[PDB]
Design an enzyme around this catalytic site. Sequence first.
Site, PDB file in Angstrom:
ATOM      1  N   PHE A  55       0.796  -1.203   0.000  1.00  0.00           N
ATOM      2  CA  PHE A  55       0.000   0.000   0.000  1.00  0.00           C
ATOM      3  C   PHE A  55       0.846   1.278   0.000  1.00  0.00           C
ATOM      4  CE2 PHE A  55       0.190  -1.325   4.510  1.00  0.00           C
ATOM      5  CZ  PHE A  55       0.692  -0.196   5.114  1.00  0.00           C
ATOM      6  N   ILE A  75       1.033   6.032  13.608  1.00  0.00           N
ATOM      7  CA  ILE A  75       0.329   4.995  14.332  1.00  0.00           C
ATOM      8  C   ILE A  75       1.159   4.562  15.550  1.00  0.00           C
ATOM      9  CG2 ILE A  75      -1.159   4.186  12.447  1.00  0.00           C
ATOM     10  CD1 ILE A  75       0.827   1.910  12.013  1.00  0.00           C
ATOM     11  N   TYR A 101      -4.846   1.395  12.638  1.00  0.00           N
ATOM     12  CA  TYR A 101      -5.988   2.238  12.274  1.00  0.00           C
ATOM     13  C   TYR A 101      -7.324   1.677  12.764  1.00  0.00           C
ATOM     14  CZ  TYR A 101      -2.609   4.880   9.474  1.00  0.00           C
ATOM     15  OH  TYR A 101      -1.513   5.610   9.085  1.00  0.00           O
TER      16      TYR A 101
HETATM   17  O1  LIG Z   1       1.151   6.578  10.844  1.00  0.00           O
HETATM   18  C1  LIG Z   1       1.201   6.595   9.587  1.00  0.00           C
HETATM   19  C2  LIG Z   1       1.740   5.418   8.949  1.00  0.00           C
HETATM   20  C3  LIG Z   1       3.118   4.988   9.466  1.00  0.00           C
HETATM   21  C4  LIG Z   1       4.184   5.989   8.926  1.00  0.00           C
HETATM   22  C5  LIG Z   1       4.251   5.973   7.407  1.00  0.00           C
HETATM   23  C6  LIG Z   1       2.852   6.309   6.856  1.00  0.00           C
HETATM   24  C7  LIG Z   1       2.500   7.795   7.029  1.00  0.00           C
HETATM   25  C8  LIG Z   1       2.745   8.549   5.714  1.00  0.00           C
HETATM   26  O2  LIG Z   1       1.803   8.148   4.781  1.00  0.00           O
HETATM   27  C9  LIG Z   1       1.013   7.964   7.493  1.00  0.00           C
HETATM   28  N1  LIG Z   1       0.867   7.706   8.912  1.00  0.00           N
HETATM   29  C10 LIG Z   1       0.304   8.827   9.698  1.00  0.00           C
HETATM   30  C11 LIG Z   1      -1.043   9.235   9.175  1.00  0.00           C
HETATM   31  C12 LIG Z   1      -1.336  10.570   8.926  1.00  0.00           C
HETATM   32  C13 LIG Z   1      -2.593  10.928   8.447  1.00  0.00           C
HETATM   33  C14 LIG Z   1      -3.513   9.920   8.197  1.00  0.00           C
HETATM   34  C15 LIG Z   1      -3.204   8.602   8.453  1.00  0.00           C
HETATM   35  N2  LIG Z   1      -1.949   8.270   8.889  1.00  0.00           N
HETATM   36  N3  LIG Z   1       1.894   5.383   7.472  1.00  0.00           N
HETATM   37  S1  LIG Z   1       1.307   4.184   6.556  1.00  0.00           S
HETATM   38  O3  LIG Z   1       0.592   3.245   7.393  1.00  0.00           O
HETATM   39  O4  LIG Z   1       2.389   3.616   5.747  1.00  0.00           O
HETATM   40  C16 LIG Z   1       0.145   4.898   5.457  1.00  0.00           C
HETATM   41  C17 LIG Z   1       0.493   5.105   4.108  1.00  0.00           C
HETATM   42  C18 LIG Z   1      -0.412   5.708   3.257  1.00  0.00           C
HETATM   43 CL1  LIG Z   1      -0.065   5.942   1.651  1.00  0.00          CL
HETATM   44  C19 LIG Z   1      -1.710   6.023   3.690  1.00  0.00           C
HETATM   45  C20 LIG Z   1      -2.026   5.816   5.041  1.00  0.00           C
HETATM   46 CL2  LIG Z   1      -3.568   6.229   5.623  1.00  0.00          CL
HETATM   47  C21 LIG Z   1      -1.116   5.235   5.922  1.00  0.00           C
END
Ligand SMILES: O=C1[C@@H]2CCC[C@H]([C@@H](CO)CN1Cc1ccccn1)N2S(=O)(=O)c1cc(Cl)cc(Cl)c1
Length: 127
Positions: A55, A75, A101
């Site tokens: 993803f 997260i 999430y």
């Molecule tokens: O906590 C996160 C986690 C862990 C760090 C890396 C990413 C970031 C950057 O995309 C997103 N976030 C925080 C976040 C910020 C806003 C909304 C949802 N999640 N993610 S993620 O799980 O890979 C992610 C990647 C992408 Cl493309 C979309 C989402 Cl919703 C979540």
Amino acid sequence: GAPATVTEQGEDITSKKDRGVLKIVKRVGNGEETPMIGDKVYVHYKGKLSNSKKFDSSHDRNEPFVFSLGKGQVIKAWDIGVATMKKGEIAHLLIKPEYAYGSAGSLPKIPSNATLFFEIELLDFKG
Ligand SMILES: O=C1[C@@H]2CCC[C@H]([C@@H](CO)CN1Cc1ccccn1)N2S(=O)(=O)c1cc(Cl)cc(Cl)c1
């Protein structure tokens, strides 16, 4: 594959010992120090769903992901997991939805009640 291995052989790194975040070290890092609350952390990662779908990936963007540790910018499993990592370490995390999430998910990319797999490389951290 890798998600199977961390599911079956990973360490429970939660303080609650609820198996919500499992970890295996793929590449041992350098020096005993680990990042601390407020540190600016630089990582590369890739994330997969339990159907194998990748993803997201920072590698695919040719630039690292940067966040401040322990501040709820990410997260819960990332604040917990990255705090365990040494500089240069590559680890795998297997994360239950309570530490990611939850039932809401994060549309459109993350479905409801998603267990997540990550490979994370800790590039550097600094106060
Ligand atoms: O906590 C996160 C986690 C862990 C760090 C890396 C990413 C970031 C950057 O995309 C997103 N976030 C925080 C976040 C910020 C806003 C909304 C949802 N999640 N993610 S993620 O799980 O890979 C992610 C990647 C992408 Cl493309 C979309 C989402 Cl919703 C979540």
